[PDB]
Design an enzyme around this catalytic site. Structure first.
Site, short mmCIF file in Angstrom:
data_model
loop_
_atom_site.label_atom_id
_atom_site.label_comp_id
_atom_site.label_asym_id
_atom_site.label_seq_id
_atom_site.Cartn_x
_atom_site.Cartn_y
_atom_site.Cartn_z
N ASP A 1 26.30 -16.33 49.51
CA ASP A 1 27.63 -16.88 49.70
C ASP A 1 28.35 -16.31 50.92
O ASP A 1 29.58 -16.23 50.92
CB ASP A 1 28.48 -16.69 48.44
CG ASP A 1 28.63 -15.23 48.04
OD1 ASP A 1 27.98 -14.35 48.63
OD2 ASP A 1 29.42 -14.96 47.11
N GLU B 1 21.07 -18.78 44.50
CA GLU B 1 22.00 -17.69 44.80
C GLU B 1 23.31 -18.25 45.35
O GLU B 1 23.78 -17.82 46.40
CB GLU B 1 21.39 -16.69 45.78
CG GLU B 1 20.16 -15.95 45.29
CD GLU B 1 20.48 -14.95 44.21
OE1 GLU B 1 21.59 -14.39 44.20
OE2 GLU B 1 19.59 -14.70 43.37
N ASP B 2 23.86 -19.25 44.66
CA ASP B 2 25.16 -19.85 45.06
C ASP B 2 25.07 -20.45 46.48
O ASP B 2 26.00 -20.24 47.28
CB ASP B 2 26.31 -18.87 44.79
CG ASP B 2 26.87 -18.15 46.00
OD1 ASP B 2 26.27 -17.13 46.41
OD2 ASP B 2 27.91 -18.60 46.52
N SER B 3 24.01 -21.21 46.77
CA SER B 3 23.92 -21.91 48.08
C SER B 3 23.92 -23.42 47.81
O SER B 3 23.49 -23.82 46.71
CB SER B 3 22.71 -21.48 48.86
OG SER B 3 21.52 -21.66 48.10
N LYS C 1 32.14 -21.28 45.10
CA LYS C 1 31.87 -21.46 46.51
C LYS C 1 30.42 -21.15 46.86
O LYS C 1 29.69 -20.51 46.10
CB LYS C 1 32.77 -20.60 47.37
CG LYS C 1 32.45 -19.15 47.30
CD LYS C 1 33.37 -18.37 48.21
CE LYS C 1 33.03 -18.63 49.66
NZ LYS C 1 33.82 -17.74 50.55
#
Ligand SMILES: [Mg+2]
Ligand SMILES: [Zn+2]
Lengths: 860, 208, 335, 79, 59, 59
Positions: free
Chosen positions: A132, C79-81, C211
Site C-alpha cells: 500500500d 497485500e492490499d494492491s 486503500k
C-alpha cells in the site's frame, strides 16, 4: 553506495524470489565499476563499443563519456570501467530503520520501466512490507570485497533458516494457501487441466492414478500434481508425507495442519539437498498454484455475512440469560474480568461455529487463531464489551457519566442490557449510543498504540550497550571481547559432536539476542490486545530490574501455599485457607467507630477523686454487629488499648498522656445522645478520662487536649499483625493460564494467600518475607514451606540464591515471550540471563544497571 | 487442616533457629547425631524451658569434622550487643580448644564495633540473624544441589581451556549458598540444572 | 457509515477525503499557486445521503464510479494492491491534470528603496534559452523540457541568478503573470501544465478506508465477462474483507447495482420505478431485505453474486463473482 | 588441532574476495573453465574442487594460534 | 496553535479547514479525558472523525 | 469566583489548616484576595456589616 532510493514496491509472482525489478529511471543513473583484465575484454569491448558504458577513467583520469563518438578505443587491461546496471548484479535492500528486524537481503537485478520495485510475494515476510505504498532504499556493493562478503553472507539461500526463531523465513502466503485448500477439496483433476498445469514446474508428468473408469477417461489426483515441483530423487519421511524417489506416496488428510505438512517437505528438502533446491521448489510451486486459481475464481457474497434469523434469535437469547445475570453480579464484584472474558469467549465460540457452515468463509480465514476469529463475530454476531473501567487510559469519570448518559432513550424506554455491551453487529449497523461507545473504545486503542513506544526504543540501546561485544571464539568459549572472560563455556546443547548446519565461531550472538528480544517488544506494544498488553511488563520485570533497593510494592508481596491435607475431612482445606488469614488480617479501631462524645456531665458523681481532677469523659461508641460479627471481644480491646498506651508513653514521646484512665468496655453505658442519633447504647466502649491537667483551669483549652489522644486511640489495631497490609484468598484454578508457580501439576484447585507487608520493610532486601515468616509462628504448622517464594525476582535472588533466580528468570522470560511471538530460540534467553548473572548478582539492562575479523589474517 | 495454636512464641523462634544451625553444620560434614536434630517441639519445650531459655546448654553444639575441626555457636537472646558481651563469651570459650565460632545475632549488629570483631587472629567468625533461620532453603523445591570441586579439579578446569582464575563466571561472597557452606574466594562450585528450557545445562562458578 | 469499524471512518473522513483528486475551481486563470490539480470528468455517487441532498454541493465528492469485482487475479492484487483495466483507462477514466507555478522577484526600477537583476534575456548563452523571449520569459505555447531556464533573472554583466527547472519538472506553458508591489518589487509567475494518466505506482481508495496501490494494468479481453458482456474496471482481492470489518462497501456496491439497473415487468400495474431506494443515510439505513429484494426485482441474483466466463480459457468459471459499482477516489503524492 | 575442522562463513567471505581481487589484478588461472568472465565465478571453482594455495591462520583468545591450509578444511556441503 | 494556512486541494479541504476547534496542551500530567468523546458532544461536535498523531482528539 | 477582566478577585478555601502537628479542625480561611492578603471569613463578614452571628449562620 547508491545512498538513496524513492520508489513504491509492488509484487510479481512469476519472477524468481531473489530477483528484484529496478526502474530504468534510476537504473541508468547507477554505476558499477569494474577492472579491465586479461580475461574480461572480449565482453567489455562488446559493452563499450555501443552504449551501456561510461567514463573510461584510468590513471590519466579521462572523464570522457560514451557519447562523443570516440569509438571502441580497446582499453588497457588494468584500467577501470564505470558502466550501467545490467542484469544479474547484486543489490542490498532496506527501508529507513523503523525497526532493526533483519531486513538485510541480497537480490538479483532485472531492469524494466514502470517506476516501482517488483519483488516476489514471499519477500513480504522477510522484508516486512505490504503493498500500500512502502518506500525502500537500495544499496550497491561497489568494491569487489563488498560484493564478495555481501554475496557470501546475505543471500536468500544462505539465510534460509531464521537466526531468530529456527524456522524457515519463507512460508506460503495469502492466495497460494487458498489454492492448496481448494486443490485439496477437489481431489481429482481432468486430463486437460492436468496437462496444462504440467507445463510449469518439471518432471513432465506421472502416469494417471485412475487410468480408466466407466464414464470419464483418465483421472489424476492432486498429489501427483504436487510432485512436479520436486527436485530429483527425493527420499524423506514425515508426519503425513511419505516421499520415495521424487514421488508423493501418501499424504495425510489434515487440512487443518496443511501449512505444516508443506512446511515439513521443504525442511526435508533443505536437509537432504540443500537450500538451492528449496528455492527451486518454491519457484516451481507458486506459479503452478496461481495458474490453478485462474479458471475457477474465488469471491464473497452477501449471504456469507448474513447469519440466519433463528440462529440470531438463539444468540440474542444468551445476552439476557448468562450475561445480563452476570452483569447483575458485576454491579458489586470488580475483578472477575477474566471470568467475564471466559463467559464472553464461551459465547463468541458458539457464535463463530455457525458462520463456518458456508463454503467461502471456511477458506479465507485461519480457523484456529484467536486474533481473527473474534473480528468476524464483530461483523456477523455482536461486538461485546466496549466499556470497562479497567481499560486504563480514560478516567473513571468518563465511565460514570457515560453510564449516566444512558438516559438518552435507554432509561426513557428500557433498563435491559447494560452500557458497554453492544448487542448489535457491524453488518446490521450500530444505533448512535453504541456507536459512540465503540468510538471511545477505538479511540483508546489509537491513543495507547500511538503514545510512548520509545521504551523498546531506549531498551534497544540499553541492550546494545552491553550485549554488543560478545562473540563465539575460535575454541567455542562465548566471551566478552573487551575482557576475554568466559560468559558461557559452550553454546547450543549437543552441538559439540561434529555435525554442522549450526552456529560457528565468529557469530555475534549477543547482537542476535538483542534484535531477537527487541522484536517481541514491538509486536506486544503495537498490538493493544489484552494478551499482548498483559505480557509487555513481564519482560520489564525481568530485564529492567534495578539492583539498588527502591522498596517498591513489588518488593513487598509474598505468596503462601498451604498443603497439609488429612485427605478426607471435607472443607478442612478452606478452613486452613482462612484461619491463617485471621491471624494476620489487620483490623483497627478507627473503622468500627461511629461517633465521639466528650461530656462534662453524667459522671460528676462518678468523679470520686478527692481533689476533683476528673471532669471530662470522652465516649467512643462502636457498632455492635461488626464487633459481634468477626468474633472480637470487648475485654481484649481493653487489653490492647491499655498496653499500647502504656508502651508508647514508655517510648520517648511526651508527658501528655501519662495519667490515662482507659476505664472499661461496657456494651451499655446510658440513655445518651442528646444531639440527635437516637440509639440505645450499643457498644459505647472506652469511656476514658484525661486528668493530666489536674484541677482543670480552663474548660475549652482542656477539651482540645482531649482531642490530641482520640487519634492515637483510633489508630490502634485489635485483631491481626500490625505489619500486614493485606491478605487475600484467591485463585482456585491452578492451571497454566495463571502466573508463575513452583508446583501445581498435582492439584487443580489449591487456595493461596497473597500477602502484602506495609512500609516497615527496611532498606535491607529480603525483609518482607522475613517479617511474614516471623509473623506466622503460631500457625506455621498449616502453612507449607519448601514452597511459597517471595514474588519479585530480586528478592528470590536474596533468599534462595543466584542459581534459583537464574531458572526463574529463564522461565519468566520464556512464558512472557511465548505469549506474543509463539516461538523463539532458547539460547538467546540463556545468553541474556547469563549476561545478567555474570558479575556477582543480577545486573539489569538499564541506566542503573549500566553503572556497574580479529580471528584470522591471511597469508600466502 | 486441624489447628491447636498455643505457643510460648519465643521458644519456637529458638527451636527453629537451633534446628536450622544444626542442619547447617550437619551439611558441612560434622559429627552430629540423628536424635539431637530430629526431636519434636513438645519434648523440646519440656526439657529446655517452656517459655524461658537463655545461655542454655542447647547452645553447646560443638563438634568435630573428622578429627580436629571445631565449630561452636553462641546464641544471643538479647536486644542489644556490645563488645563486653562478646568478649565475655569468647575469652572464656576459646580455651575449650576451638578454631572457628559462629554468631547468632537477634537484634542487630552495628559497624561501630566491627574491627574488634575481625581482629581475632586465626579464629574466623560467621554471623546471622535469628529471623533468617526459620526455614530450610536447601529443602525448598527450587534449590539446586551444588557440588564443590577439589583443588586438583580446579587446576584441571583452569588448564583444560587454558583459562585464568579471574575469568570465570563469578558469584558473590554474600550469596545464600556461599555463606551457608562456609566457602572461600577461589573455590569452584558446579551446578546441574533442571527445567523445561534449561535441563541438561551445566555451569561453573568461583567465588569473588 | 455506521457499519464500518471506527478506525476506517476516521481514515476516510480525516485524510482520504482531504486528499482525493477532483474539482479545483471555476476560474483557474487567477489562482497562481503551487500544484493545482483537477480531474477531467468528475462525478456524483449513484446513492444519496441526507446531508448531500440538503447541502446540494456536488463538490463534496471527488472521484469516479468504478465497477469493482472481488476475485483472485494472477497474484498481482495481493497485500492490499488493486488491478485496473487498460481499456477503461484509455477512455479518460481517472485522467488528471496538474498545474505548477514558478516565481521570482527583483527590486523596484532603479532605486535602492551591480545588484540589479532585471528580468531579461542575457543573450550570451548561459544555459538553455531555446524558448525564452527578449523580456526574460517564455512564450505561451512552449513545451518546457526536463531541465531548461524558466525565468531569465540575470543581471547586466555578472553571472546568472536565473531560476531553472530541477530534474522532475516539465510541461506546456499555460500563462505568464507579471505583477508588482508598492515599492516596485516586480513579481513574476509562470505556470506549466501536464496531463497524467494513472501509472503503475499510484494509490487509490474506496469510501471506506480501504486503500491500495495500482499494481497491474490489464488489457480488456482477459477479464471475466458476464452474459451481458460487462467487464470490471477495478479488481480487488477477497482477503481484504473478513479482517478489516467493512461490510459497508459490499452493501454500497449492492445498493448502487440495484439503482443503476433497469426494471422488468414494467407493462401495467405500476410505473415500476417508484419503489427504488437511493438513501444510504448513515444512522438510518436500508435493511438487508430491502436491498436483496431490490436485486430480485431488477433481475439479478439475491445473494449479490453474478456468473462470469473466463477471458482466457473461455469456459465457465466455477465460483460466482460479486460485482457492482463503487465510488472510488484517486489520491495525491503519485509515484 | 582443537579448532573446528570446518570453515567459517567469514573466512570464505575473505578468501574469495582476495582470490578474485588478485585474479582481476592479473593472476594466472589454475582451473579449467568454460568461458566464465566473472572473477567470483572463477574463484568459486578451485574452492569447489580444492585447488587454492592459501594458508589460514586461526588466532586463539589466549595468545597462541594455528596453521591450516585451505585444502585441509572441509567446505564439503554433503548432507 | 492558532492561525494556519488554508488548503485548496479539494473544495472540501477548505470546508474542513474552516470548521475546527482546538484544546490547548496545558501540561501532560493527567490531562484526563481531553482526547476522548464526552457525552456533551452530542449534536455539537463530531464523535467519529479526528486527526491522529501528535494532536489526536485535541482538534 | 473567576473574572477574566478585573484582575483582583478571590477564592474561598476550606481544606487548609495552616499546620498538621496532631490535627486541627478544617476552618475556612478566605484565602488570597488581592494576589496577597489572606483574611479569615468572619472579618470579611463584619467588615461588610453583618449585625451578629446566627444570621451569618442563616446566610
Ligand atoms: Mg508497501
Ligand atoms: Zn460511650
Amino acid at each position: 553506495s547508491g545512498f538513496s532510493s524513492r520508489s513504491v514496491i509492488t509484487g510479481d509472482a512469476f519472477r524468481n524470489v531473489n530477483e528484484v525489478g529496478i526502474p530504468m529511471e534510476i537504473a541508468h543513473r547507477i554505476t558499477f565499476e569494474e577492472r579491465v583484465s586479461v580475461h574480461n575484454i572480449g565482453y567489455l569491448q562488446e559493452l563499450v563499443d555501443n552504449k551501456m558504458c561510461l567514463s573510461y577513467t584510468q590513471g590519466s583520469t579521462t572523464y570522457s563519456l560514451r557519447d562523443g563518438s570516440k569509438g571502441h578505443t580497446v582499453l588497457k587491461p588494468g584500467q577501470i570501467v564505470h558502466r550501467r546496471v545490467m542484469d544479474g548484479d547484486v543489490v542490498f535492500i532496506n527501508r529507513p530503520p523503523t525497526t532493526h528486524k533483519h531486513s538485510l537481503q541480497a537480490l538479483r537485478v532485472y531492469v524494466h520501466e514502470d517506476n516501482t520495485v517488483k519483488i516476489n510475494p514471499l519477500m513480504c515476510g522477510p522484508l516486512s512490507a505490504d503493498f500500500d505504498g512502502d518506500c525502500v532504499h537500495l544499496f550497491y556493493p561497489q568494491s569487489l570485497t563488498a560484493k564478495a562478503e555481501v554475496l557470501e553472507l546475505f543471500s536468500v539461500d544462505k539465510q534460509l533458516r531464521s537466526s531468530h526463531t529456527g524456522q524457515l523465513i519463507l512460508q506460503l502466503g495469502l492466495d497460494s494457501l487458498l489454492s492448496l485448500r481448494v486443490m485439496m477439496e477437489q481431489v481429482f483433476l481432468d486430463k486437460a487441466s492436468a496437462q496444462q498445469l504440467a507445463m510449469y514446474g518439471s518432471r513432465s508428468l506421472p502416469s494417471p492414478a485412475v487410468v480408466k473408469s466407466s464414464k470419464s477417461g483418465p483421472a489424476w489426483t492432486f498429489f501427483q500434481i504436487l510432485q512436479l515441483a520436486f527436485p530429483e530423487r527425493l527420499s524423506c519421511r514425515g508426519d503425513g508425507f511419505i516421499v520415495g524417489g521424487s514421488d508423493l506416496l501418501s499424504f495425510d488428510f489434515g487440512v487443518d495442519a496443511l501449512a505444516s505438512i508443506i512446511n515439513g517437505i521443504v525442511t526435508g528438502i533443505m536437509v537432504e539437498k540443500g537450500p538451492k533446491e528449496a528455492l527451486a521448489f518454491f519457484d516451481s510451486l507458486q506459479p503452478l498454484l496461481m495458474e490453478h486459481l485462474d479458471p475457477q475464481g474465488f469471491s464473497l457474497s452477501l449471504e456469507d455475512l448474513s447469519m440466519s434469523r433463528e440462529d440470531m434469535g438463539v444468540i440474542h437469547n444468551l445476552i439476557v440469560r448468562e450475561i445480563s445475570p452476570m452483569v447483575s453480579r458485576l454491579r458489586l464484584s470488580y475483578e472477575d474480568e477474566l471470568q467475564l472474558e471466559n463467559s464472553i469467549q464461551k459465547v463468541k465460540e458458539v457464535a463463530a461455529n455457525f458462520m463456518l457452515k458456508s463454503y467461502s468463509m471456511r477458506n479465507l480465514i485461519d480457523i484456529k487463531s484467536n486474533s481473527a476469529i473474534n473480528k468476524l463475530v464483530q461483523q456477523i454476531g455482536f461486538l461485546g464489551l466496549q466499556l470497562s473501567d479497567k481499560k486504563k487510559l480514560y478516567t473513571k469519570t468518563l465511565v460514570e457519566d457515560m453510564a449516566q448518559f444512558y438516559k438518552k432513550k435507554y432509561v426513557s424506554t428500557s433498563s435491559s442490557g447494560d452500557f458497554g455491551i453492544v448487542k448489535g453487529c457491524f453488518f446490521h449497523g450500530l444505533d448512535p449510543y453504541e456507536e459512540m461507545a465503540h468510538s471511545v473504545a477505538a479511540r483508546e486503542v489509537i491513543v495507547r498504540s500511538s503514545r510512548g513506544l520509545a521504551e523498546p526504543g531506549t531498551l534497544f540501546k540499553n541492550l546494545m550497550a552491553v550485549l554488543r561485544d560478545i562473540v563465539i571464539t575460535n575454541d567455542g568459549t562465548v566471551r566478552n571481547t573487551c575482557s576475554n572472560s568466559i560468559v558461557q563455556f559452550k553454546y547450543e546443547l549437543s552441538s559439540d559432536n561434529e555435525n554442522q548446519g549450526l552456529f560457528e565461531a565468529g557469530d555475534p550472538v549477543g547482537v542476535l539476542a538483542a534484535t531477537a528480544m527487541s522484536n517481541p517488544a514491538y509486536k506486544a506494544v503495537l498490538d493493544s490486545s489484552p494478551n499482548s498488553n498483559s505480557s509487555w511488563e513481564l519482560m520489564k520485570e525481568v530485564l529492567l530490574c534495578k539492583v539498588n533497593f527502591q522498596n517498591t510494592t513489588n518488593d513487598r508481596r509474598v505468596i503462601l501455599y498451604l498443603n497439609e491435607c488429612r485427605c478426607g475431612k471435607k472443607y478442612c482445606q478452606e478452613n486452613s485457607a482462612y484461619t491463617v488469614r485471621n491471624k494476620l488480617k489487620k483490623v483497627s479501631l478507627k473503622d468500627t467507630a461511629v461517633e465521639f462524645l466528650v461530656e462534662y456531665r453524667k459522671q460528676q458523681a462518678i468523679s470520686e477523686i478527692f481533689g476533683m481532677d476528673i471532669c471530662l469523659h470522652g465516649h467512643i461508641h462502636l457498632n455492635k454487629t461488626l464487633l459481634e460479627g468477626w468474633n472480637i471481644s470487648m475485654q481484649d480491646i481493653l487489653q490492647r488499648c491499655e498496653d499500647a498506651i502504656n508502651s508508647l508513653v514508655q517510648k520517648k514521646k511526651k508527658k501528655a498522656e501519662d495519667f490515662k484512665k482507659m476505664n472499661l468496655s461496657v456494651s451499655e453505658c446510658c440513655s445518651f445522645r442528646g444531639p440527635g442519633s437516637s440509639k440505645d447504647s450499643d457498644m459505647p466502649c472506652l469511656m476514658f478520662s484525661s486528668y493530666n491537667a489536674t484541677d482543670p483551669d480552663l474548660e475549652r483549652t482542656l477539651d482540645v487536649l482531649c482531642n490530641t489522644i482520640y487519634p492515637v486511640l483510633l489508630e490502634t489495631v485489635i485483631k491481626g499483625d500490625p505489619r500486614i497490609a493485606s491478605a487475600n484468598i484467591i485463585w482456585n484454578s491452578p492451571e497454566t493460564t495463571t502466573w508463575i508457580r513452583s508446583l501445581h501439576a498435582s492439584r487443580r484447585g489449591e487456595w493461596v494467600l497473597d500477602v502484602t507487608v506495609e512500609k516497615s520493610d527496611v532498606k535491607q532486601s529480603g525483609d518482607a518475607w522475613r517479617v511474614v515468616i516471623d509473623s506466622c509462628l503460631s500457625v506455621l504448622h498449616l502453612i507449607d514451606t519448601k514452597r511459597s517464594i517471595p514474588y519479585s525476582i530480586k528478592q528470590v535472588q536474596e533468599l534462595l540464591g543466584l542459581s534459583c533466580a537464574f531458572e526463574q528468570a529463564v522461565q519468566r522470560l520464556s512464558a512472557s515471550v511465548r505469549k506474543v511471538s509463539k516461538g523463539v530460540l532458547k539460547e538467546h534467553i540463556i545468553l541474556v540471563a547469563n549476561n545478567m548473572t555474570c558479575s556477582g548478582d543480577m545486573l539489569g539492562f538499564n541506566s542503573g544497571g549500566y553503572k556497574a575479523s580479529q580471528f584470522e589474517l591471511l597469508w600466502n | 487442616s486441624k489447628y491447636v495454636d498455643p505457643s510460648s512464641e519465643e521458644s519456637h523462634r529458638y527451636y527453629l533457629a537451633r534446628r536450622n544451625a544444626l542442619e547447617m553444620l550437619r551439611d558441612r560434614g560434622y559429627e552430629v547425631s540423628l536424635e539431637d536434630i530430629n526431636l519434636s517441639l513438645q519434648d523440646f519445650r519440656t526439657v529446655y524451658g517452656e517459655r524461658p531459655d537463655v545461655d542454655r546448654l542447647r547452645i553447646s553444639a560443638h563438634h568435630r569434622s573428622d578429627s580436629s575441626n571445631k565449630v561452636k555457636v553462641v546464641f544471643f537472646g538479647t536486644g542489644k550487643v556490645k563488645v563486653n558481651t562478646i568478649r565475655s563469651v569468647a575469652a572464656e570459650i576459646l580455651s575449650q580448644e576451638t578454631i572457628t565460632g559462629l554468631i547468632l545475632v537477634l537484634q542487630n549488629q552495628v559497624t561501630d564495633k566491627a574491627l574488634k570483631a575481625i581482629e581475632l587472629f586465626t579464629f574466623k567468625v560467621e554471623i546471622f540473624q535469628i529471623t533468617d533461620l526459620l526455614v530450610n532453603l536447601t529443602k525448598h523445591v527450587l534449590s539446586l544441589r551444588h557440588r564443590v570441586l577439589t583443588d586438583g579439579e580446579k587446576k584441571a578446569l583452569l588448564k583444560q581451556f587454558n583459562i585464568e582464575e579471574k575469568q570465570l563466571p563469578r558469584i558473590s561472597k554474600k550469596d545464600a549458598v556461599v555463606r551457608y557452606y562456609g566457602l572461600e574466594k577461589g573455590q569452584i562450585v558446579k551446578v546441574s540444572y533442571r527445567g523445561e528450557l534449561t535441563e541438561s545445562y551445566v555451569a561453573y562458578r568461583c567465588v569473588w | 457509515a455506521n457499519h464500518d469499524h471506527g478506525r476506517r471512518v476516521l481514515y476516510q473522513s480525516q485524510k482520504h477525503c482531504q486528499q482525493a483528486i477532483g474539482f479545483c475551481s471555476t476560474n483557474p486563470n487567477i489562482r497562481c499557486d503551487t500544484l493545482s490539480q483537477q480531474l477531467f470528468y468528475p462525478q456524483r455517487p449513484l446513492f444519496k445521503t441526507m446531508a448531500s441532498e440538503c447541502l446540494q454541493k456536488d463538490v463534496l465528492f471527488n472521484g469516479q464510479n468504478a465497477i469493482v469485482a472481488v476475485n483472485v487475479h494472477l497474484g498481482f492484487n495481493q497485500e492490499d494492491s488493486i488491478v485496473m483495466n487498460k481499456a477503461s483507462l484509455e477512455r479518460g477514466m481517472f485522467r488528471s491534470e496538474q498545474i505548477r507555478s514558478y516565481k521570482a522577484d527583483v527590486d523596484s526600477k532603479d532605486s535602492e528603496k551591480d545588484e540589479v537583476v532585471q528580468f531579461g534575456k542575457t543573450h550570451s548563452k548561459i544555459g538553455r534559452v531555446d524558448s525564452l523571449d527578449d523580456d526574460g520569459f517564455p512564450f505561451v505555447g512552449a513545451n518546457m523540457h526536463s531541465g531548461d531556464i524558466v525565468i531569465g533573472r540575470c543581471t547586466e554583466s555578472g553571472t546568472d541568478h536565473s531560476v531553472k527547472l530541477k530534474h522532475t519538472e516539465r510541461g506546456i506553458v499555460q500563462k505568464v503573470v507579471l505583477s508588482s508591489n508598492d515599492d516596485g518589487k516586480n513579481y513574476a509567475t509562470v505556470s506549466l501544465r501536464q496531463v497524467r494518466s494513472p501509472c503503475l505506482g499510484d494509490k487509490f481508495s474506496s469510501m471506506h478506508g480501504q486503500k491500495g496501490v495500482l499494481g497491474y494494468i490489464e488489457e480488456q479481453e482477459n477479464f471475466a465477462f458476464t452474459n451481458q458482456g460487462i467487464v470490471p474496471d477495478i479488481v480487488i482481492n477477497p482477503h481484504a474483507f473478513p479482517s478489516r470489518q467493512t461490510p459497508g462497501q459490499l452493501l454500497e456496491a449492492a445498493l448502487s447495482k440495484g439503482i443503476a439497473c433497469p426494471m422488468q415487468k414494467k407493462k401495467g400495474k405500476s410505473d415500476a420505478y417508484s419503489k427504488v431506494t437511493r438513501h444510504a443515510t448513515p444512522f438510518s439505513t436500508p435493511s438487508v431485505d430491502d436491498i436483496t429484494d431490490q436485486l430480485h426485482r431488477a433481475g439479478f441474483s439475491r445473494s449479490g453474486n453474478e456468473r462470469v466466463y473466463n477471458g482466457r480459457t473461455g469456459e465457465m468459471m466455477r465460483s460466482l463473482i460479486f460485482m457492482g459499482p463503487n465510488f472510488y477516489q484517486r489520491l495525491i503524492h503519485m509515484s | 588441532r582443537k579448532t573446528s575442522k570446518f570453515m567459517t562463513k567469514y573466512e570464505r567471505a575473505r578468501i574469495l574476495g582476495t582470490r578474485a581481487l588478485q585474479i582481476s589484478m592479473n593472476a594466472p588461472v589454475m582451473v579449467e573453465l568454460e568461458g566464465e568472465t566473472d572473477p567470483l565465478e572463477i574463484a568459486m571453482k578451485e574452492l569447489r574442487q580444492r585447488k587454492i594455495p592459501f594458508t589460514i591462520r586461526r588466532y586463539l583468545p589466549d595468545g597462541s594460534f594455528e596453521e591450516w591450509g585451505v585444502d585441509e578444511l572441509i567446505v564439503e556441503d554433503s548432507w | 496553535g492558532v492561525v494556519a494556512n488554508l488548503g485548496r486541494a479539494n473544495p472540501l479541504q477548505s470546508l474542513i479547514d474552516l470548521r475546527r476547534t482546538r484544546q490547548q496542551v496545558l501540561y501532560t500530567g493527567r490531562v484526563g479525558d481531553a482526547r476522548y468523546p464526552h457525552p456533551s458532544h452530542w449534536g455539537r461536535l463530531c464523535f467519529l472523525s479526528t486527526p491522529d498523531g501528535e494532536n489526536c482528539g485535541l482538534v | 469566583y473567576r473574572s477574566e477582566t478585573k484582575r483582583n478577585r478571590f477564592i474561598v478555601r476550606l481544606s487548609e489548616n495552616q499546620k498538621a502537628e496532631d490535627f486541627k479542625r478544617k476552618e475556612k480561611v478566605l484565602t488570597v484576595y488581592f494576589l496577597s492578603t489572606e483574611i479569615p471569613v468572619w472579618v470579611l463578614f463584619f467588615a461588610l456589616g453583618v449585625a451578629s452571628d446566627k444570621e451569618a449562620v442563616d446566610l
